[PDB]
Design a binder for this molecule. Structure first.
Ligand SMILES: Nc1ncnc2c1ncn2[C@@H]1O[C@H](COP(=O)(O)OP(=O)(O)NP(=O)(O)O)[C@@H](O)[C@H]1O
Ligand SMILES: [Mg+2]
Length: 358
């Protein structure tokens, strides 16, 4: 007892976490990979809307040693916010450690523990031992504002794993944890995690990650979303972030499609004294993404000649209108519980971790 069990999926867009709550079920949320220096004191995923935390950890250095930060959403608005630098083609570790520890704390607060040991179960994209040791030790997160203002969580990380080999990265395709731990309603396979800014094409052969053909591209949903937004704003002549566009406009419709294959989606936008039907605009970007992904998956299938191709990630949902065709194709596997496709990897890392504890 007094332990937090989770799977951790980090990137340049979000830090994703899937953990076990008090009633033994999987709970998931994502903290945007954004931070900003904050004053020593105050001025459905409610608790991460406003994150102002003091973080004391030895994995942090210099001025970041034990000061305060705006983390995630509440950081994206700040002037001097920090985000992953990326050129026209570490010592930025706080940019990844801080949203990481912050997620561990939020989950800890959610389940009413104030001291938690967190066996680390995560992943790296194309050493393992060295990266883990920027995580070991004791980390304290105090909330200075928001839902858990005044709370102080002690995170202890003694043991970890990056789930490099074997079926660990995949486990969420076959299993689910409902008070633990139950089956969902080949020997050569690809895993395609379809994300916001990137697309991860990994290939597993004979129990081992094929560390030469396992690639990684920037085929993300974001560029397609930006296109759609540009075409909507022009239709008028609305949304604050992309996640706002996805959550408010896209998610409710993608969902009725899931539970009814006959349902036609409608996308309308209210901006000012005008309301427009932009169903045609949205669906265009969706199928464009779908076909571009269909093409990308095809050639990676041919390049690896995998026996089966698993497609996961939120891109399965954003491009669902087109990507649901992969259900009818032998050689492709979509998650049965497809509404959890976005957190497939973190959910997989969580399942790998629960097994590690046994
Ligand atoms: N239910 C949904 N319906 C439609 N789009 C969704 C849904 N869930 C997630 N998305 C979108 O799918 C895209 C991919 O999400 P996700 O895989 O979680 O990105 P990410 O992993 O955080 N970024 P990356 O590091 O590149 O993988 C994003 O644009 C999400 O907003
Ligand atoms: Mg991802």
């Amino acid at each position: 007892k007094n332990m937090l069990l989770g799977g951790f999926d980090t990137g340049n867009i979000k830090a994703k976490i899937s953990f076990l709550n008090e009633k033994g079920n999987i709970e998931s949320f994502a903290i945007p990979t954004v931070i900003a220096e904050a004053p020593p004191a105050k001025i459905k995923d409610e608790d991460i809307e406003l994150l102002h935390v003091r973080i004391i950890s030895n994995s942090l250095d210099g001025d970041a040693r034990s000061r305060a930060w705006y983390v995630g959403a509440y950081a994206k608005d700040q002037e001097d916010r920090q985000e992953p630098t990326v050129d026209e083609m570490q010592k930025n570790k706080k940019l990844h450690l801080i949203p990481l520890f912050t997620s561990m704390a939020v989950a800890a607060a959610r389940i009413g523990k104030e001291e938690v040991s967190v066996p680390f179960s995560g992943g790296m994209p194309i050493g393992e031992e060295q990266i883990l040791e920027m995580l070991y030790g004791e980390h304290t997160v105090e909330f200075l504002d928001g839902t858990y203002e005044g709370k102080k969580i002690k995170i202890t990380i003694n043991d970890g794993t990056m789930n490099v080999e074997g079926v660990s990265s995949v486990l969420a395709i076959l299993f689910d944890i409902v008070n633990g731990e139950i089956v969902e309603v080949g020997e050569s396979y690809a895993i395609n995690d379809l994300g916001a800014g990137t697309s991860d094409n990994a290939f597993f052969e004979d129990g081992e990650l094929n560390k030469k053909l396992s690639t990684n591209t920037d085929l993300g949903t974001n560029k397609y979303i930006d296109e759609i937004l540009k075409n909507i704003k022009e239709r008028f002549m609305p949304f604050k972030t992309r996640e706002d566009f996805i959550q408010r406009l896209v998610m409710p419709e993608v969902e009725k499609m899931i539970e009814d294959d006959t349902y036609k989606p409608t996308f309308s936008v209210k901006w000012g004294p005008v309301k427009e039907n932009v169903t045609d605009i949205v669906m265009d970007g969706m199928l464009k993404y779908a076909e571009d992904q269909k093409a990308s998956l095809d050639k990676f299938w041919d390049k690896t000649n995998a026996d089966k191709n698993i497609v996961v990630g939120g891109g399965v949902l954003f491009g669902y209108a087109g990507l649901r065709d992969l259900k009818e194709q032998d050689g492709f596997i979509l998650p049965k519980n497809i509404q959890e496709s976005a957190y497939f990897t973190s959910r997989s890392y969580l399942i790998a971790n629960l097994l590690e504890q046994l």
